[PDB]
Paper text:
In the context of neurodegenerative diseases, abnormal aggregation of TDP-43 has been linked to amyotrophic lateral sclerosis and frontotemporal lobar degeneration through the aggregation of its C-terminal domain. We found three different fibril structures in our sample that share the same basic fibril protein fold and differ in the number and relative arrangement of the fibril protofilaments.
Subjecting the cryo-EM images of Morphology-1 to a reconstruction of the three-dimensional (3D) map resulted in the subdivision of the extracted fibril segments during 3D classification. The two distinct 3D classes were identified and refined. We hereafter refer to these two structures as Morphologies-1a and 1b. Morphology-1a is C2-symmetrical and consists of two structurally equal, in-register protein stacks. In the case of both Morhphology-1a and 1b, extra densities were observed near the contact sites of two protofilaments. We find that the majority (~66%) of the fibrils visible in our micrographs are mixed and contain segments from both structural forms. The segments of the two structural forms are not randomly scattered throughout the mixed fibrils but occur clustered into distinct z-axial regions of variable length. These features imply that Morphologies-1a and 1b do not represent systematically distinct fibril morphologies but sub-morphologies that are able to coexist in mixed fibrils.
Residue numbers in the entry:
A (entry chain D), B (entry chain F), C (entry chain H), D (entry chain J), E (entry chain L), F (entry chain B), ...: 304 to 348
Write the structure that this text describes.
Amino acid sequence: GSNMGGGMNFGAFSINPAMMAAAQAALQSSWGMMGMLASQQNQSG
Amino acid sequence: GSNMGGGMNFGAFSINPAMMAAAQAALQSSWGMMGMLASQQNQSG
Amino acid sequence: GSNMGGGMNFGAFSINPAMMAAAQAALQSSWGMMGMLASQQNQSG
Amino acid sequence: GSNMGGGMNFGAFSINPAMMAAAQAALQSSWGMMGMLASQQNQSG
Amino acid sequence: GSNMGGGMNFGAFSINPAMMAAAQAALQSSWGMMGMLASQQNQSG
Amino acid sequence: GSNMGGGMNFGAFSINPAMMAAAQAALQSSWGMMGMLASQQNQSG
Amino acid sequence: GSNMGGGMNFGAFSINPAMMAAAQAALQSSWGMMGMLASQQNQSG
Amino acid sequence: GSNMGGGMNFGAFSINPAMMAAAQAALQSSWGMMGMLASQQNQSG
Amino acid sequence: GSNMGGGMNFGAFSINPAMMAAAQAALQSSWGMMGMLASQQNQSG
Amino acid sequence: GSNMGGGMNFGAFSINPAMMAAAQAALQSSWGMMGMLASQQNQSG
Amino acid sequence: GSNMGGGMNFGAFSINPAMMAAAQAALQSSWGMMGMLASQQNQSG
Amino acid sequence: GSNMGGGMNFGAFSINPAMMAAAQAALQSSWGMMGMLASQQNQSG
C-alpha cells in the first residue's frame, strides 16, 4: 500500500535527462510534471 | 495498491530527454504532463 | 490496483524526446498531456 | 485494475519526438493530448 | 481492466513525430487529440 | 504502508541527470515535479 | 469610447437576483452570460 | 477612453443579489459572467 | 485613459450582495465574473 | 492615465456586502472577480 | 500616471463589508478579487 | 507618477470592515485581493 500528497509547481522545469544502458532487460522512463512507474523485470539464470 | 494526489503546474516544461539502449528486452517511454507505466519485461535463461 | 489524481497544467510543454534502441523486443512510446502504457514484453531463452 | 484522474491543459504542446529502432518486434507510438497503449510483444527463442 | 478520466486541452498541439523502424514485425502509430492502441505482435522462433 | 505530505515549489527546476549502466537487469528513471517508482528486479543464479 | 476583452466561463452560474424599485423612472435589467446596457433616464423638475 | 483585459473563470458563480431603491430616478442592473453599463441619470431641480 | 490586465479565477464566487438606497438619483449594480460601469448622475440644485 | 497588472485567484471568494445609503445622489456597486467603475456624481448648490 | 504589478492569491477571501452613509453625494463600492475605481464627486456651495 | 510591485498571498483573508459616515461628500470603498482608487471629492464653500 502506497499514498502520495498533491503539490503545486509554479516554476518551468526544463529537464534534459540523457541515459544509456546495456543489459539483458532495459527500461528507461523520462517524465515531466507527474508520473508513477511499477516495472517488474523478472529474470532466471 | 497505489494512490497519487493531484497537482497543478503553471510553468511550461521544456523536456528534451535523449535515450539509447541495447538489451534482450528494451522499453523507452518519454511523457509530458501526466503518465503511469507498468511494464513487465519477463525473461527466461 | 493503481489510482492517479487529476492535475491542471497552464504552461505549454515543448517536448523533444529523441530515442534509439536495439533489442530482441523494442517499444518506444512518446506522449503529450496524459497517457498510460502497460507493455508486457514476454521472452523465452 | 488501473484508473486515471482527469486533467486540463491550457498550454499548446509542440511535441517533436524522433525515434529509431531495430528489433525482432518493434512498436513506436507518438500521441498528443490523451492516450492509452497496451502492447504485448510475445516472443519464443 | 483499465479506465481513463476525461480532460480538456485549450492549446493547439503542433506535433511533428518522425519515426524509422526495421524489425520482423513493425507498427508505428501517430495520433492527435485522443487515442487508444492495443497491438499484440505475436512471434515464434 | 507508506504516506507522503503535499508540497509547493515556486522555483524552476532545471535538472540535467546523465546516467550510464551495464547489468543483467537495468532500470533508469528520471522525472520532474512528482513521481513514485516501485521496481522489483527479480533474479536467480 | 469603451472596450472589453473576451473571457471563458466553465462553471454554471445559478443567479437569483430579486429587485424592487419605486421612482419617477425605473429600469431593472437582469442578464446571464454576456450583456451591455446604456440607459439614459432623462428628468426635468 | 477605457479598456479591459480578458479573463477565464472555472468556478460556478451562484450570485443572489437582492436590491431595493426609492428615488426620482432608479436603475438596478444584476448580471452574470460579463457586462458593461453606462447609465446617465440626468436631473434638474 | 484607463487599462486593466487579464486574470483567471478557479474558485466559485458565491456573492450575496444586499443593497438599499434612498436618493434623488439611485443606481445599484451587482455583477459576477467581470464588469465595467461608468455612471454620470448629473444634478442641479 | 491608469494601468493594472493581471492576477490569478484560486480560492473561492464568498462575498456578502450589505450596504445602505441616503443622499441627493447615491451609487452602490458590488462586483465579483474583476471590475472597474468611474462614477462622476456632479452637484450644484 | 499610475501602475500596479500583478499578484496571485491562493486563499479564499470571505469578505463581509457592511457600510452605511448619509451625504449630499454618496458612493459605496465593494469588490472581490480585483478592481479600480475613480469617482469624482463634484460639489458647489 | 506611481508604481507598485507584484505580490503573492497564500492565506485566506477574511475581512469584515464595517463603516459609517456623515458628510457633504462621502465615498466608502471595501475591496479584497487587489485594488486602486483615485477619488477627487471637490468642494466650494
